[model samples]
Target chain A: PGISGGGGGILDPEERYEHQLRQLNDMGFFDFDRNVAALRRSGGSVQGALDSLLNGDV
Target chain B: MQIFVKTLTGKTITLEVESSDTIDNVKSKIQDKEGIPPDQQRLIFAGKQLEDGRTLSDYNIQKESTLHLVLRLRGG
Candidate 1:
């Protein structure tokens, strides 16, 4: 669970978001603009990028 | 014409690149050319970026010779 997936209760929201973002970013989701645009469609700001990531989507 | 690539996860992928391009170009192109993706890509050659304007031969990059890449994990 640590290496690829799973979330912890103690990590909190910010920590969870940060960890998730780092992993997603490292995995080579290269289309920044498209991803950002998708967020915008969901009424989400750039800040919410990490808040919504699908591990299986990639 | 094969170039070497490495990722932050310690996964290595070698690619065949053309005669002209910089190491940075290689990094970006690896994703497009080889589908390795940019975020997981890191490169090193003699402690510097590959010759920006020089052909692979100028940088001692032999045809089918291997280069090096490393995956960088950071603290968020």
Candidate 2:
């Protein structure tokens, strides 16, 4: 039980890669959680994430 | 309202849900789409883990909102 943070009463704090998320949203990828996770996995290659997102394996 | 539920792999699934629907209900819907059991699913939005008993309205979750679905793993 070491996880922690705040905003009080149920909300997440700010995101660092907000721009990447915005791009995904604009492209019809509105799933913020997975989008953020993907950004992290690709280390900022939002398009790489897009490739993995749609192509499954390429 | 129509919302999106995304899996860990960046794959998203669209769902038609209601503010009155409980998180449990949402989980069931996911199970319908991908066959993941409701009990094995964990829903999170904006970092807050959803409670099975709470309605979407309780979180002020709006239409077109996106949520993350994580798999619940227990002790091995």
Candidate with best TM-score: 2
lDDT of each: 0.48, 0.70
Off by over 4 Å in 2: A1-58, B74-76
TM-score to native of every candidate shown: 0.38, 0.55
Clashes of each: 4, 0
Model 1 chain B scores worst on lDDT over the 10 consecutive residues at: B67-76
- The i-RMS of every model, in angstroms, reads 12.3, 8.6
- Measured on C-alpha atoms, candidate 1 has an lDDT of 0.48
lDDT tens string, model 1, A1-58? Answer: 5433465877544343343333234444445544444354434332234234332221
Model 1 misplaced stretches (Cα beyond 4 Å): A1-58, B33-42, B47-55, B70-76
Docking class of 2: incorrect
